[PDB]
Write a protein that binds this DNA or RNA. Structure first.
Ligand SMILES: [K+]
Ligand SMILES: [K+]
Ligand SMILES: [Mg+2]
Ligand SMILES: [Mg+2]
Ligand SMILES: [Mn+2]
Lengths: 59, 369, 79, 95, 67, 79, 75, 83
RNA sequence: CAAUUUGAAACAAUACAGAGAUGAUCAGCGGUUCCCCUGCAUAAGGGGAACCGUUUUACAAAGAGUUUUU
């Protein structure tokens, strides 16, 4: 359910924290099987292995 | 097609007699490959090792024709003879379940017949198949093999040996099921499990040849009983299917055509491979890779004799040839886990085999491709 | 294409930069699919982030080295 | 693999898991997978049960990559079978 | 793939790398594995050094955006 | 007796020495290992080296039978 | 292959093997596999350079995890 | 197999590899232990309702790293102590 | 709806005709992909691997929601 929760939520405002602590916010366009994350409206292509966790918004 | 492909084997296989002691498969290939593409070469020593025989199976009929022009040519200092292999093939069945190609070869060695080729069947679609074609070197030798081996009792099995001709094949003793003449009746009550009542209730459909009632059903006071009924002709079984969902006494019975063992075992394996359960799965292991010619008895003998497993520790052995493997179902998960460890890397039929879970078997197969 | 550049760098000097502050300058002998690199007569550097002058030469290698491509971040042809 | 089979033989045995973060958890091995994740039932911590972060938890799943040691008792292992199995695996050890 | 590097084939991109290093340069080319050819490359460490023409291994790339 | 791992199976049932992440060393009788260098040691003795200020402590653990996750293992030899 | 041919032609030579932690092993390369696991005879252990303080001298073969090997080079 | 089925839609204690806890309810998970949990909070304020935690960062449903002041000093001290 | 466990018993002699084996038993029809061989790096042909659509299922009872070898 994680991966398909990301590809079928193709468009929501999400809050990624990267492993260096370097936080990032924006709207997501595409998710890979590896959980690569392509985004815009940013504070970008992000390698999945470079994610710490993702705070989400909706439900 | 039973005369077509037989005329093709006869048509494209040649026998070479009197090759030099030094001639191996490679040299036979090198000598005959100019005749045409060769599918296979077997070389065997003569009885007294003074010369060699070859069986050469050519790709096309043109190869056999070209090969025969080499008859009576000289190889080394040997005058060779090349001929169509014809009327030189035996069909054998009901040898012991653990007889192997080496074992069959030793049988002919014992009655002094050189065997050029022993061909055993694939167990892909039926695990119980057990027969062999053997090409020998003369029609005389084939008739002698029949004379000495047809009817021989060996290790409890009375061997069947025939000059091979598929047109003369016997009706199997289980032919009624193959032919669609056996119905299975299910969900009878114990009160209804009686051959006379069953003949009376079903004989209107047609002449009944036989009724088989699995034993132990009345004696254990089963809720539901099953019975099998064989009709003399397929039309009778088909009309007997009318009784499905009908009432017999106070029991709604189900009636269907009896399934055959290979179908039933394969659906059992399909259930196993698709399982996401764990009580059943944790009691089994896989062995792989295995030839699709290796039968479950052969694997069982390996578990008892080399690994020293007790016969009553093995619940079931099923082939999974689509992954070059076999499943061994044991009685509990701890024994299964220990067997997984004991068996991995053991040697079977001179080759190292691996053990693992089903996913290990699948991964190994995918990785080899 | 990156790999065509790397291929075209064989027998030239190359600078191999790791994920850490470490680099190896040397003659590129060859590489494989996982971009493991064969270097000839490699200099090994530890690199100071602030001042490239207070960099530290860790060792002078002689002969050939296999540098695992696990850690290879950046390839600079010519050093 | 090998240790997967080893632990499946130790299922229903009481073990002590020491983790990379130094927490030790005594418990009953209930399941294991190809990554050597462990499901321990009825866990209890050793010596320093001082971590009210745990002990009240019925059954825990342990990520195999966070384990440092798994302590067992000699009664629990056939060392002949373990050494022999290793040698058989070892022939097969370039993965 | 997921991020089409072609739109960036002639502009300056910023690329973060696994070990903490940050790199800025003009994207000259790439492959399906996201290996990159960068020109006028400057390398920052965690402090800038100029390196010119370089090849970055796609395996250690952790984030990409426009410069 | 070919890959280094195979040579390690020659040390099975013999006394081994293991250096671990976290300033730690083990000695025990080698019962098992895989290609990740996970290891089962019997009659083991762990030794943790720590820094008390000026540093030098040496604590010790002993155990009958112990699984060791390969990813903490940095080197193996004999005592 | 150039890398495997290299491993082939350093079996038996004295080498330096530096780990990702920066620990450096010198000695005779008894064995290496495709994963760069290493066995070394007559191995010394230094941090970064042979010129630095000696950490261990080994009297039998030392085994090294291929996942931690950063480089192997002729000494 | 050791799956997280039995733990679905239930309150859980999570230990992260950094050595921080989270209390949550796990709606979904994959074979890489990516925790899809809801109603998360520190073991003690709720951080978010609905978040994806990455399997690499799950320790258990200090930190797991054992990096030290590079250790080599300790090893040479240990060497000379046995000399 | 499916998955699991069950009612429950798979008889009838083990065998009883080659990859010439088969029931979607490992199929058929329709379509997509990938690999290998020969071949002019053509074309065209062939033989080894996945996938999607569809065609198919005795009964009852329960019950059922590139991260992991630092
Ligand atoms: K057989
Ligand atoms: K189909
Ligand atoms: Mg039953
Ligand atoms: Mg073409
Ligand atoms: Mn029978």
């Amino acid at each position: 359910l994680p991966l398909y929760l990301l590809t079928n939520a193709k468009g929501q405002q999400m809050q990624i924290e990267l492993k260096n602590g370097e936080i990032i916010q924006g709207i997501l366009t595409n998710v890979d099987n590896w959980m690569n994350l392509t985004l815009s409206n940013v504070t970008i292509y992000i390698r999945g292995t470079f994610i710490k966790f993702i705070k989400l918004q909706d439900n | 097609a039973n005369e077509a492909l037989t005329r093709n084997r006869e048509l494209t296989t040649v026998l070479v007699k009197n090759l030099p002691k030094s001639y191996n498969q490679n040299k036979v290939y090198k000598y005959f490959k100019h005749c045409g593409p060769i599918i296979h070469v077997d070389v065997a020593d003569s009885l007294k090792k003074n010369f060699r025989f070859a069986r050469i199976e050519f790709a096309r009929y043109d190869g056999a024709l070209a090969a025969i022009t080499k008859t009576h040519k000289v190889v080394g200092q040997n005058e060779i003879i090349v001929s169509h292999l014809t009327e030189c093939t035996l069909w054998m069945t009901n040898f012991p379940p653990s007889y192997t190609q080496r074992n069959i070869r030793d049988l002919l060695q014992d009655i002094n017949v050189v065997a050029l080729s022993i061909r055993l069947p694939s167990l892909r679609f039926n695990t119980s198949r057990r027969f062999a074609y053997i090409d020998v070197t003369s029609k005389e030798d084939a008739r002698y093999c029949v004379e000495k081996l047809n009817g021989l009792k060996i290790e409890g099995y009375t061997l069947v040996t025939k000059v091979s001709n598929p047109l003369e094949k016997s009706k199997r003793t289980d032919s009624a099921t193959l032919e669609g003449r056996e119905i299975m009746i299910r969900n009878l009550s114990t009160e209804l499990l009686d051959e006379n009542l069953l003949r009376e209730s079903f004989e209107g459909f047609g002449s009944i040849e036989k009724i088989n009632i699995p034993a132990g059903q009345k004696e254990h006071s089963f809720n539901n009983c099953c019975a099998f009924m064989v009709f003399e002709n397929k039309d009778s079984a088909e009309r007997a299917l009318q009784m499905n969902r009908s009432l017999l006494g106070n029991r709604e019975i189900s009636v269907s055509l009896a399934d055959k063992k290979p179908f039933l075992e394969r659906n059992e394996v399909k259930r196993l491979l698709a399982s996401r359960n764990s009580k059943e799965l944790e009691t089994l292991i896989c062995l792989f890779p295995l030839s699709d010619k290796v039968s479950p008895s052969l694997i069982c003998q390996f578990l008892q004799e080399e690994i020293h497993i007790n016969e009553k520790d093995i619940r079931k052995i099923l082939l999974v040839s689509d992954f070059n493997g076999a499943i061994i179902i044991f009685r509990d998960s701890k024994f299964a886990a220990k067997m997984l460890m004991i068996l991995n890397g053991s040697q079977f039929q001179g080759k190292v085999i691996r053990s693992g879970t089903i996913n290990d078997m699948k991964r190994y197969y995918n990785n080899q491709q | 294409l990156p790999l065509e550049v790397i291929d075209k760098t064989i027998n030239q000097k190359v600078l191999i930069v790791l994920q850490s502050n470490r680099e190896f300058e040397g003659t590129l002998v060859g590489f494989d699919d996982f971009v493991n690199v064969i270097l000839e007569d490699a200099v090994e550097w530890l690199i100071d982030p602030e001042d490239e002058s207070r960099n530290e030469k860790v060792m002078q290698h002689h002969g050939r080295m296999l540098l695992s491509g696990n850690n290879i971040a950046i390839l600079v042809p010519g050093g | 693999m090998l240790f997967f089979s080893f632990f499946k033989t130790l299922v229903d045995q009481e073990v002590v898991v020491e983790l990379k973060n130094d927490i030790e958890i005594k418990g009953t091995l209930q399941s294991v997978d190809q990554f050597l994740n462990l499901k321990l039932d009825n866990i209890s911590c050793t010596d320093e049960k001082k971590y009210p972060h745990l002990g009240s938890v019925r059954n825990i799943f342990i990520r195999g990559s966070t384990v440092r040691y798994v302590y067992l008792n000699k009664n629990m292992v056939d060392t002949n079978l373990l050494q022999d199995a290793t040698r058989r695996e070892v022939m097969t050890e370039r993965k | 793939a997921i991020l089409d590097l072609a739109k960036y084939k002639d502009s300056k991109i910023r690329v973060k790398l696994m070990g903490g290093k940050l790199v800025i340069g003009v994207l000259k080319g790439y492959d399906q594995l996201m290996n990159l050819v960068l020109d006028d490359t400057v390398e920052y460490m965690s402090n800038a050094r100029k390196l010119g023409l370089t090849v970055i291994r796609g395996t250690i790339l952790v984030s990409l955006s426009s410069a | 007796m070919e890959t280094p791992l195979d040579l390690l199976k020659l040390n099975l049932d013999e006394r081994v020495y293991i250096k671990l992440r976290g300033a730690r060393t083990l000695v025990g009788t080698l019962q098992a290992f895989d290609s990740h260098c996970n290891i089962v040691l019997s009659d083991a003795v762990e030794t943790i080296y720590q820094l008390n200020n000026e540093e030098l402590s040496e604590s010790e653990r002993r155990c009958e039978m112990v699984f060791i996750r390969g990813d903490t293992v940095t080197l193996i030899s004999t005592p | 292959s150039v890398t495997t041919e290299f491993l082939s032609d350093i079996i038996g030579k004295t080498v330096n093997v530096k780990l990702a932690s920066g620990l450096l092993y010198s000695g005779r390369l008894e064995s290496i596999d495709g994963f760069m696991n290493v066995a070394l005879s007559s191995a010394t252990e230094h941090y970064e350079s042979n010129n630095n303080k000696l950490l261990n001298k080994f009297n039998s073969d030392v085994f090294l995890r291929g996942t931690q090997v950063m480089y192997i080079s002729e000494q | 197999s050791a799956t997280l089925k039995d733990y679905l839609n239930k309150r859980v204690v999570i230990i992260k590899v950094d050595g921080e806890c989270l209390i949550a309810s796990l709606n979904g998970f994959d074979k890489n232990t990516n925790l899809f949990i809801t109603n998360v909070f520190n073991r003690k304020e709720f951080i978010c309702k609905a978040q994806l935690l990455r399997g690499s960062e799950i320790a258990l449903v200090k930190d797991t790293k054992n990096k030290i002041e590079n250790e080599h000093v300790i090893w040479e001290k240990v060497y000379e102590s046995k000399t």
